[model samples]
Target chain A: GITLRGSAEIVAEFFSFGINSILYQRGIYPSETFTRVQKYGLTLLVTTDLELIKYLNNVVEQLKDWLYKCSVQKLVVVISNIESGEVLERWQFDIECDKTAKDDSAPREKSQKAIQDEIRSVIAQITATVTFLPLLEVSCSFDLLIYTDKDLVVPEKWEESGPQFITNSEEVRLRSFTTTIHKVNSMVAYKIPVN
Target chain B: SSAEQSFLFSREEADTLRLKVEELEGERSRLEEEKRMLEAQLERRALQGDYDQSRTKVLHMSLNPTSVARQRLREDHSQLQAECERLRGLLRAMERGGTV
Candidate 1:
């Protein structure tokens, strides 16, 4: 029996781990800053820098809150040139929430095993994007954008921001996972630098 | 400490191995995505071909004498009406000539 909170936890945790994996694989930070660990039956890396650790954890914490309230619509990881401030790529995870689940205490009937498998497939595809995705040749930084319901209050330390999109970009759709309560779709959009 | 050296030999070697593993896994992942894309493309082309074939078959059936007769009859009616108008015009012209 999957409850809304249960589903929220699953999704927020996925973002916590999934975003860290992206930062490592995409070389947004130095590889030395990340250390390998095992999760979801795959070797994943997480940041060791104290500030980044706290930053991501805080984001994930707020993510859980919105996810539980079914207020969040999307979570995006925007990687950009550190100096030029131009967006180089975007990894977006769009979430679809079942509002019916908010009222129904009746548990959803998805197995955790199946959900984890789907998530792993998505993260694996994220890691595999290195094969086709353009290299971040210059030093780049990443920012997270959480799209929430228009009615919700803006959390402290979080401000309204424009949807940062890349020009002349190619988008690739990745795998998705459904918790029976929430369905998450993954996509990555990137721009090839024009010579 | 020395026994560990026997397996990995050096830090550089271990890093190289790790990178190689990452490379191979990425390659496999890329190929799997490519396979999925190829399968989808093949499905689309097959669907397109099948639809075209079925449409051609329908057109072939439509080419039967009944439909051909229907089409030809419409053209025949138009020609007859045109000829009628031409003859009517000539008769009117002749009547006007007699009056003049």
Candidate 2:
């Protein structure tokens, strides 16, 4: 597991098509001219709007067939949202799934544990499908990050922190931090881990 | 005058007539060979053109960036090469002037 960050601007460009599509589908745009943004091999960064999430879920389903038809090797999907106190909670519950346990552990404990496993499985499935089925050489990652004005500094630091793991090394070290501000609303960074 | 004519009509005259006839036959054979060569050239050119077109098409289609598309191009290419070789043999026979 490697952690990386990128300026929101670059990430947005990568998934500009997807973002535009979501806007179009949501009727945010007056017309559908934005649909042309869909180009192959572009990264997609999505906001965590419920409508957008639902739309993406559908898109993921469609991706199976689209990849087959186009013979594309892989696809990557990234979901992001603004940070609030609930941001971590959302990540823990919705994305991380720390609470879907099988045993009769306290409802809170079971829910917390189960959610983590569930989220992990979901992420695994999404990444595996894109990489293995499409024969895309790169591993497609689905990253969920929370950003806000107060948390902006934290994100900057997070981005600087390189991968925590090194091959055959017992010590986990923090890497450097760099940040790119894509827009007023977001910042992103890419972290390359050293094994 | 009859006796003079008889004397003139000796072995040399007979041989000269035979040579003239043989020359005419040789000239005719040469012309036939020339015609065959021209036809062979035409056939070879046609075959080469066909091969060229097919190969070009294959290369163009192979650029489709898909496995299936490339496979189709290769199949067409192989077919065209086979046809070209067959035409080549026919052209070779014509060039040899009726094959000995």
Candidate 3:
């Protein structure tokens, strides 16, 4: 499976890891809830919570399917207050795949180190953003919103959703990395008081 | 003024030493904060939870000795605090003497 479908799975896995990084770096969960594991020449913290594990696994499965069909364009992580329902932040990763890279076609064999180097920079920026970000004021939860093309047939359980836009938000453009098959452009949008 | 007559330092010298003591106190506080931040980071990095990855190297090698560096910083911070407290005591003594 050297084809785009394989690449789709890789891209979907990237989201899974990236989401864990976000959760750890942003304090979405307390420190005790995560465990640091080695990956890509760095130690990364991933949640140990059973519910989070199942939830992400489910999303990853669906994401791979959408990406394989070339239907998904964006994946966004929204952190919001539980009671007030105010969106506090949005971490968006936009996916741009080579539409011509079909299921049967093979993606190029690039050095794994190079791919990791590109990813490391994105991770570095994420860790540093903490200096400026204010502490989350209350109990919070997060949502993963996938943006797919209109014509794609979503299963009955999946519902159509609108973009969860934050008012007075500021965005920081982060480093992007590419697989020989799929390129991911990463950016983070957080609520900022413009006044 | 016999006590003043025997005193080695001029008024200016006393002031300069006071300023140096003030500077050391500042350094101590900064070190205290750095150590606290490092402790929090390390706790967070536990297999169950951490990095302000301090990018410091002496030999131009890529490897980072984070734990060793942190221990050394902690030592320096404690030493700095000890010396700063000593200086503060000396300042209070001078003030009690009512002389420059």
Candidate 4:
């Protein structure tokens, strides 16, 4: 079985660059004064924005199909604001995997913190070279979401209290709301419920 | 001297090949995504047109005594609903990076 666990950062970066280029080329901003905006280290999830929710839902639906076709057995999606580094939304699906199958070769000490670090590195590389145009900056926010599987759990040092955890037969969902984007650098433990 | 020359040639060739592969991969992915988006947009527009046509037929059927027209309108509505669902799924897939 193929285990599919990855972040949505690649797609997010693609769109960010796209929106920036479109806005910049259209002369949405005043001449030559447009400078690339610095990414804010915050991610936020607001449930009340219907338009954004619809847009996100459409995007994720496409992602789900890709995961299914790619033979992914699990997926966790996190949405954040790149400028502020705040997580605004998240979704996870444990693709059909035989839990009973004995696989001793599976890395027993894998840490979710490590996975998050890897994701951050990937995003940093992607955004580092992206130059955004001016008016496009206002059209969309620099939010991002990192999705992965339940197996990648944050280490104890990164865990925080009061994070929401939703458990279901297939998978577990974890979410945390942050007032400041910079605080997202820490990881939190996500517990999976055994049924 | 021959060995060193071969190694240098291979290294340069490998770098050039790597760059070419990367460029081709990027182009392929972009084209695939564009294809999917266009297909979805076409399906959506077709469904919208069908729905509008059926709605017009229904309005006309109420005035004219034509059972065939009513039945056709009902069938069209059902087809339109299915199309709508498929389009929704397609839209979701596109949003999620579901490429062609």
What are the DockQ scores of the candidates, in order? Answer: 0.01, 0.00, 0.00, 0.01
Candidate 4, RMSD to the unseen true structure: 32.9
Residues A1-195, model 2: lDDT tens digits: 111121222222223343343333323333423323213333323444555466544544433232222222222223222242111101111111111222323322123233333333333323322221112123222332222223323312234322222132111111111111111111111121223
**Per-model lDDT:** 0.86, 0.34, 0.78, 0.39
TM-score of chain B of each: 0.36, 0.37, 0.38, 0.43
**For every model shown, what is its TM-score relative to the native structure?**
0.66, 0.16, 0.62, 0.23
Query: What local lDDT does model 4 show for residue A75?
Result: 32
Please name the candidate that would achieve the greatest TM-score relative to the true structure.
Answer: 1
Off by over 4 Å in 1: B1-100
TM-score of chain A of each: 0.97, 0.21, 0.92, 0.28
What is the lDDT for A66 in model 3? 84
User: Backbone collision count in every prediction?
Assistant: 0, 26, 3, 38
Model 2 alpha-carbon drift over 4 Å, by segment: A1-10, A32-35, A41-146, A149-195, B1-100
Against the correct fold, how does model 4 do in TM-score? 0.23
Ranking by lDDT: 1, 3, 4, 2
Candidate 3 lDDT by residue in tens digits, B1-100:
2232223124335756888999999999999999999787777874743433487433544555886798899999999999999999999997999863
Model 4 alpha-carbon drift over 4 Å, by segment? A1-48, A71-110, A131-195, B1-100
* Order of models, best DockQ first: 1, 4, 3, 2
Q: Candidate 3 — what's its lDDT?
A: 0.78
